[PDB]
């Protein structure tokens, strides 16, 4: 997995670019924007493509409780295939771009100032993760 | 050339992604963010890779006069070779990403609300221009 500290927090217009491959036997993988590395802590964004159940779930987490889930339209990910995700942190929320198209806009639940850590893991084979 | 309107202007954290190829005979190509009037050649951003002089120049233009040029470090473009540029419209300015690295940060001179047209031209072959 990728696990990167953002010590200075993220400021409006941070762009996370994730390039990788979905393994042919993949279940699920995630991109998390978190407050910190203590296990089970706050998540401003939990982005969770699920190949096993044909859905992409967005959510937040506070004080140990998942929020209200959102689902993206369809599944722009395929077993055995590469992908490129952009996550664009503006003042409105997180715009997820997959492939050549905007995929979903997840409006902020937590303050952006609370993100200190990016985590990419699960069933995914990474080419690169960049924070611009 | 590619020419696309930004009907609400360029919004904060707009991401422009430009994929193309530098022809083997290239002189220079440009990405311009311009005002919306037929009359107008004001450029909030003039991004100008120059293979003939081996430099990449950033500048702005207003009322027919170029401002102070900024030069990027080296030239991450090669005749005969494909490229991917991101232009990220931030709070502070335009962040230019080439390949896998942030390349140059051009601080704002013109107001974002005056940018209405993205134009890509010169000696370049485009695969895609996308506004996220
Ligand atoms: O909300 C994200 C979490 O979902 C958890 O599974 C949910 C499931 O999606 C929902 O339909 C319902 O059954 O509640 C489950 C548990 O909260 C995952 O277990 C967890 O990993 C998150 O992805
Ligand atoms: O600032 C962008 C413009 O550069 C012009 O070329 C400059 C050149 O870079 C510099 O050496 C100067 O002293 O002479 C020229 C006049 O500005 C280009 O002609 C113009 O197209 C812009 O790219």
Curated annotation (Swiss-Prot), chains A, B:
Keywords: Apoptosis, Cytoplasm, Lectin, Nucleus, Secreted. It comes from the Eukaryota. Disulfide bonds: none annotated. SMART domains: Gal-bind_lectin (SM00908), GLECT (SM00276). One of its GO terms (cellular component) is extracellular exosome. Residues 2-132 form the Galectin domain. Mainly expressed in stratified squamous epithelium. InterPro entries: ConA-like_dom_sf, Galectin-like, Galectin_CRD. Its main location: cytoplasm. It is found in: Cytoplasm; Nucleus; Secreted. GO terms for biological process: apoptotic process; heterophilic cell-cell adhesion via plasma membrane cell adhesion molecules. Induction: By p53/TP53. The keyword Nucleotidyltransferase does not apply. SUPFAM superfamilies: Concanavalin A-like lectins/glucanases. GO terms for molecular function: carbohydrate binding. A beta-D-galactoside binds at residues 66-72. Could be involved in cell-cell and/or cell-matrix interactions necessary for normal growth control. Pro-apoptotic protein that functions intracellularly upstream of JNK activation and cytochrome c release. This is Galectin-7. It comes from Homo sapiens (Human).
């Amino acid at each position: 997995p990728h696990k990167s500290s953002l010590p200075e927090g993220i400021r409006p217009c941070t762009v996370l670019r994730i390039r990788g491959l979905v393994p042919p036997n993949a279940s699920r993988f995630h991109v998390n924007l978190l407050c910190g590395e203590e296990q089970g802590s706050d998540a401003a964004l939990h982005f969770n493509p699920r190949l096993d159940t044909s859905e992409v779930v967005f959510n937040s987490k506070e004080q140990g409780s998942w929020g209200r889930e959102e689902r993206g339209p369809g599944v722009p990910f395929q077993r055995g295939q590469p992908f490129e995700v952009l996550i664009i942190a503006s003042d409105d929320g997180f715009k997820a771009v997959v492939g050549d198209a905007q995929y979903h806009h997840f409006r902020h639940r937590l303050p952006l100032a609370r993100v200190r850590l990016v985590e990419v893991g699960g069933d995914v084979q990474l080419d690169s993760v960049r924070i611009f």
